[PDB]
Design an enzyme around this catalytic site. Structure first.
Site, mmCIF file in Angstrom:
data_model
loop_
_atom_site.group_PDB
_atom_site.id
_atom_site.type_symbol
_atom_site.label_atom_id
_atom_site.label_comp_id
_atom_site.label_asym_id
_atom_site.label_seq_id
_atom_site.Cartn_x
_atom_site.Cartn_y
_atom_site.Cartn_z
ATOM 1 N N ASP A 35 17.922 66.872 -17.020
ATOM 2 C CA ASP A 35 19.456 66.792 -17.443
ATOM 3 C C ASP A 35 19.558 65.374 -16.449
ATOM 4 O O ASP A 35 19.625 65.675 -15.241
ATOM 5 C CB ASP A 35 20.034 67.784 -16.814
ATOM 6 C CG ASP A 35 21.665 67.701 -16.867
ATOM 7 O OD1 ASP A 35 21.895 66.558 -17.422
ATOM 8 O OD2 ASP A 35 22.306 68.313 -16.461
ATOM 9 N N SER A 199 28.044 50.055 -22.688
ATOM 10 C CA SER A 199 27.839 49.564 -23.722
ATOM 11 C C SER A 199 28.661 48.494 -24.461
ATOM 12 O O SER A 199 29.762 48.175 -24.170
ATOM 13 C CB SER A 199 27.768 50.658 -24.884
ATOM 14 O OG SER A 199 27.561 50.102 -26.317
#
Length: 330
Positions: A35, A199
């Site tokens: 994770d 992004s």
């Protein structure tokens, strides 16, 4: 040193991935959920409330000759999906795919919430976010990656998740045969303890690319892709019959649809998520309404590049003094 382990979807939908981890002496092998959005290594154990264990493999520290109780240490964690666990702490030997750490904090669950109990395939979590998020009290503990870093050939690990197929976590090296083209690296902020990056934008299907900054985290421990409501609306508007359902808890779509791809930007590069990756199947057995793999992050408080996005790429988690993230197509 290096390590290399196969990671395997837990079910037909890729709801999560499990990776075998050796704990203790003699080895006890547990299948953990790697994770990159948390920083605790915790396991089902011989100390876990019996009624809260249902099929998982447990760690028994009394059977490990290298296990030592970390005196006074406790832990307690709550995840973004509402699940939680807590308990006490041992240090023990932990190996992943041939890579060994001695004195790793192994957090032994005394209690787990129902969603963990109900998932017999996941024996615990192995956190790979930054150690500043580790919940152990009163002395915070380091992640497996943090502990291994100095010994690695290169201070990196990579995530290569499969679509409906096994993939790979590598530690300490970049497998140049595992991706196509080049790896594009992008800056990381560690201020929230996450692999947080920005992004450069998105496209829906064969549509034009929209240049826009989207801050979010690279999180292998989250199934879906969570993005701003504007972006998510633009995606599902291209699927006939798709709608946001408050009763279901997100966007659903007719199971008879062909989904468009979703592209996200990494600097000047582009990662394409095929439409099939965005199908998470009937909302209930036998239903013709299907659950979408792209959902709104509104009210999460953060955008999450979960498995839906990450499995479309070869991803480099670069733990150099100044960390960075790298993405390649594959």
């Amino acid at each position: 040193s290096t390590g290399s382990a196969t990671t395997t979807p837990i079910d037909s939908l890729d709801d999560a991935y499990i990776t075998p981890v050796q704990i203790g002496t003699p080895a006890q092998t547990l299948n953990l959920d790697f994770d990159t959005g948390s920083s605790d290594l915790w396991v089902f154990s011989s100390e876990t409330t019996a009624s809260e264990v249902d099929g998982q493999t447990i760690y028994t520290p009394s059977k490990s000759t290298t296990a030592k109780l970390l005196s006074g240490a406790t832990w307690s964690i709550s995840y973004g999906d509402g699940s939680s666990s807590s308990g006490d702490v041992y240090t023990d030997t932990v190996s992943v795919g041939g890579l060994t750490v001695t004195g790793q904090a192994v957090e032994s669950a005394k209690k787990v919430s129902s969603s963990f109990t109900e998932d017999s395939t996941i024996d615990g979590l192995l956190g790979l976010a930054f150690s500043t998020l580790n919940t152990v009290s009163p002395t915070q503990q380091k992640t497996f990656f943090d502990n291994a870093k100095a010994s690695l050939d290169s201070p990196v690990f990579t995530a290569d998740l499969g679509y409906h197929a096994p993939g790979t976590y590598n530690f300490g090296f970049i497998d140049t045969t595992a991706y196509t083209g080049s790896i594009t690296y992008t800056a990381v902020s560690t201020k929230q303890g996450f692999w947080e990056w920005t992004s450069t934008g998105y496209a829906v299907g064969s549509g034009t690319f929209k240049s826009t900054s989207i801050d979010g985290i690279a999180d292998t421990g989250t199934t879906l892709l969570y993005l701003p409501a504007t972006v998510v609306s633009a995606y599902w508007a291209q699927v006939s019959g798709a709608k946001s359902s408050s009763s279901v808890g997100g966007y659903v779509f007719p199971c008879s649809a062909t989904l468009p791809s979703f592209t996200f930007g990494v600097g000047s590069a582009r990662i394409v998520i095929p439409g099939d990756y965005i199908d998470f199947g009937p909302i209930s057995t036998g239903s013709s309404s299907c659950f979408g793999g792209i959902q709104s992050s509104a009210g999460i408080g953060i955008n999450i590049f979960g498995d839906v996005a990450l499995k479309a790429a070869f991803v480099v988690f670069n733990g150099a003094t100044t960390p960075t993230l790298g993405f390649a197509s594959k």
